[PDB]
């Protein structure tokens, strides 16, 4: 099938306007990584075969010293997400801990595909190969946190319904 994520979000509305979610990196550090790697990330969405590792995510993980030779430091990642939740609604503690558990469980279930993705060779000019672990975790975290948002903390409007639909399958890039 055609990659649904090639369409981009259906509305340019900032997701924070739908729900304020926990984070692992400050927006400024995320934007630096996004600007550097979005170009090739979009190209990789239009390539068949084994999913190609997302460099935007590896950049984010490197900015927080969480990534090392195909592994993510779960202890340090949990500490960072929990830090962001300290002044948030109390519902976020459990939602965050459950989201981390589910994302690491999912990553383990696709270990072989992730490992094969790490071994891919550049398929176009200047493509940088990144290990898929960072994107596997980060994509899952963002989508799960947004979907678990309590209705009392979620903006119930048409544009946020569109973002809920889009982001149930497509990660925050």
From Swiss-Prot:
GO terms for biological process: sensory perception of smell. One of its GO terms (cellular component) is extracellular region. This is Odorant-binding protein 47. It comes from the Eukaryota. It comes from Anopheles gambiae (African malaria mosquito). One of its GO terms (molecular function) is odorant binding. The gene is OBP47. Belongs to the PBP/GOBP family. Disulfide bonds join 5-170, 18-160, 19-149, 33-59, 55-130, 103-140. Transmembrane segments: none annotated. Glycans are attached at residue 62. It is found in: Secreted. Glycosylated. Head without antennae (at protein level).
């Amino acid at each position: 099938m055609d990659n649904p994520c090639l369409k981009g979000p259906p509305v340019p509305k900032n997701a924070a306007e739908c729900c304020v979610t926990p984070f692992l990196v400050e927006p400024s550090a995320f934007m630096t990584c996004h600007s550097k790697w979005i170009g090739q990330t979009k190209r990789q969405m239009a390539m068949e075969g084994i999913p190609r590792g997302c460099c935007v995510a590896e950049c984010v993980m490197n900015s927080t010293s969480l990534y090392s030779n195909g592994k993510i430091d779960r202890e340090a990642l949990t500490k960072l997400y929990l830090d962001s939740t300290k002044s948030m609604a109390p519902e976020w503690n459990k939602i965050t801990l459950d989201a981390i558990d589910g994302c690491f469980k999912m990553a383990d279930s696709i270990k072989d595909e992730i490992e094969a993705g790490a071994k891919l060779t550049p398929a176009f000019e200047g493509e940088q190969i990144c290990h898929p672990i960072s994107g596997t975790i980060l994509a899952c975290m963002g989508m799960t946190l947004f979907a678990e948002c309590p209705a009392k903390l979620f903006t119930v409007n048409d544009d946020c319904n569109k973002l809920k639909s889009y982001h149930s399958k497509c990660p925050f890039l």
